[PDB]
Ligand binder design. Sequence first.
Ligand SMILES: CCn1c(C(=O)c2cc(C)cc(C#N)c2)c(C(C)C)c(=O)[nH]c1=O
Lengths: 553, 403
Amino acid sequence: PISPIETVPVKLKPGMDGPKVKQWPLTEEKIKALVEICTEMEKEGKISKIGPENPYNTPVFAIKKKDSTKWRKLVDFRELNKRTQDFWEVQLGIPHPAGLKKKKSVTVLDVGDAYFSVPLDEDFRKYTAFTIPSINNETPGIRYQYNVLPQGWKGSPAIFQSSMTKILEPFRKQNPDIVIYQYMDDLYVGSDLEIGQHRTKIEELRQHLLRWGLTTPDKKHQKEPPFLWMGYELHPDKWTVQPIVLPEKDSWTVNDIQKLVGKLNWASQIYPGIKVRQLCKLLRGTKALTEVIPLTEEAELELAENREILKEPVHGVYYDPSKDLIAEIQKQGQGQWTYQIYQEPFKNLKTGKYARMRGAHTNDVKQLTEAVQKITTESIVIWGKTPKFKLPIQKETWETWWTEYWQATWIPEWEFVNTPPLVKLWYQLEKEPIVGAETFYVDGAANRETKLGKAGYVTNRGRQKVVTLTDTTNQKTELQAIYLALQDSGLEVNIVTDSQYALGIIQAQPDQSESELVNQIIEQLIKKEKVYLAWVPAHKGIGGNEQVDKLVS
Amino acid sequence: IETVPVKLKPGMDGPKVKQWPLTEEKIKALVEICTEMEKEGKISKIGPENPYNTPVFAIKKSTKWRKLVDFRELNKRTQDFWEVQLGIPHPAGLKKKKSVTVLDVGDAYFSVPLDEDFRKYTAFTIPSINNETPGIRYQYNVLPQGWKGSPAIFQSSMTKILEPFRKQNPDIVIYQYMDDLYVGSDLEIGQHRTKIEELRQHLLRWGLTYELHPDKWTVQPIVLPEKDSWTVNDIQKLVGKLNWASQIYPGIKVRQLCKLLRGTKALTEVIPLTEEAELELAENREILKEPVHGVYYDPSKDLIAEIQKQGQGQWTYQIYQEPFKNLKTGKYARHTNDVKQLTEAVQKITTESIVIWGKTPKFKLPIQKETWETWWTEYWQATWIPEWEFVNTPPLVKLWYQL
Ligand SMILES: CCn1c(C(=O)c2cc(C)cc(C#N)c2)c(C(C)C)c(=O)[nH]c1=O
């Protein structure tokens, strides 16, 4: 049928006019097939015969469907689409299984001929004109225009969805007890009535859909659980991802490793503790998909650890709105984090992974807070409320951090949980200068064109030491000078620098870095008893700064 | 009533800012609110043929949820209309007043119809949890709150409403900014408050149902300690701070002081102060107390604001148009909640900014984008929203503005 629902007014982009492409001449079998299709469509109202004056045209083609002897009408809307107005996004975000409430009864209803079942703005139809060419194009062709939403036109998915929304609206007002998800040309319907009163509410729905143009499957043609949907397996009171098979291979190609990582990432939605750091490392660099990459030993270990987790099947449960959400996070290692969200321990709604580095240098407290933040956003999306957290960090460790760090922060309600490795601070710079501790006035300096560098220091006990660095930046030398003062000093040491850059880095208490130097400074700062770091203005003739500044050049 | 044609700035198109995820309780509050405004004909449900979108949020003022539409983009895109075509003049006498009361007159706007051809640009979306349904989409049929066009358009009705009250109190300064009325006088506080009630009654006959003290507003000068014995470290921190000042305040001198830091000395060492250093130090403290020489407000330029977290519930801020040329610097203090405080400091700063310049600053915020994105709404009470970005504070700057 074609829905009686009022049409959505459509227009072209303001500067523009509708397409006027020329019809490519087509073979005889194709012209035949197109005529057969169009005549059938025309008799259902889908399209109408026109003749010029209508100036517009969009090319039509016919393809031979798979191996079968069926033909299909393909229309190339490229130009009309470029000239058609933008619409609002159809649906931004898709439901996650973990967010569904458990239902006593669920039914899937797919709309038949969804697009062709919805009218097109009368005033817009004329821009959809296409022409079936005569044999070798010797005579005038047969011209139609759409009365309904064309396949492949820009506005179709959006106008359809809004039509379904308007049509569904009343049944929703009258049936709050009933849940309906709109996805594409599907309806998913659930309630907590017993079979009978549900089977009954369905038919009402269907019948309402029918008054409105939309045909739907009958009791006998409704699919049964488990439903497979967008990569998931949806059972009556649980869900999981669709079955994942890690390929056995002697030799892995880029393409194979990419697909493997994608499957792992997908699996990590509900399989706890999936990791892909060591695999992703392989993907770094620039190669073709066809290239074989030898698995490193750590990647080989990783695939193995994943292989075992995937061994026995896991599932997630659905959301009970009357209980709180709890989220647990664990450190999995080098910048890697995993989490689980449950309501009853330890039956997970879902699980997940966090890796991203924010900057070149951070520490676990920063990283853990980034993961709390990422999990909070996701939980608001899926459930509409923030979880209660259980974190591998003492409350006192976290408050020491927050109070003395310069960036503001605030994680929602959380508790300590003793699930090592725990996140801790690995050193703390002194807050005051250390009496009886040797003061190193350090400095670095590189020549811009040469790339030659020289890092040194001077102390108040008269020590001095300069070293040369090759192919170094004006700011690498400033870190070297600090590393230098760290390894020649005692367990207590004050260091004076004029590098805000170096100061900024160290003052944030990094415990990991992309930089080898910074990784070395860190190992040092941990070995120490007390380090106090101070900053001075360069070239102001201040104290020992003048001296070590002279030594480097 | 006859509507006012509204033109976007030529070329550029309307807003298409995505909606942020909202919690269930805020969504529900928004549905109620919007179902009611639709009954009252202020908004209407819209189709997919409307490409545009601006964000909406719910704030809690009172224990009544309120709707806050984020028109930052639209305003930026309509700026020719509300600023150059129908600009509202900012009184310089406002900031001189003993007391300023801020009144919300946003209800005024719901009675004036919005230009038919402009309505599509006010589109917004109420989201749904887990994307169960498509958003609920509306646009405005009347002057929306949050849009800088609404006061621009409504102003001449505002002038009529206020004309008697102005005539009768010629020394009272009234300034409209967005959804707000700013009312300043020099009266004693009881009389000032009496005058505000009198004003409310005027407003009340036209369907329009806290105290600032701008005098009390004074610099947060960069403060040079007054110390007992000075260490090398202490003088080093003093030079660094004065070296910062010298980018800003003409006349700052450092020679006499750093003469003290001679050789390669231990940081903890106590070094006595020169006759000259102490004079220099004194002459510099004079300079920091006063306003910056050479820095002036350019009305064509944007205002910027930086905030440093000082710890212990203290927060410093500076306002400028070009970096380091400070028009104002200040302090806000006193939650063990960093985001709650930061939120307070931004609203306070914005408010002072509106009183002084008639402009909202763009903020440089010392916080991770996503954290702020998730939480600012829990504590926000203002009806406008400044522009902001997110910054890592240089550890130096924070130290130079400490107290
Ligand atoms: C059984 C899974 N389920 C479902 C559901 O059956 C469903 C859900 C989606 C998103 C897609 C598909 C398909 N194909 C099916 C719903 C429905 C009524 C939303 C619900 O409420 N609660 C729920 O546990």
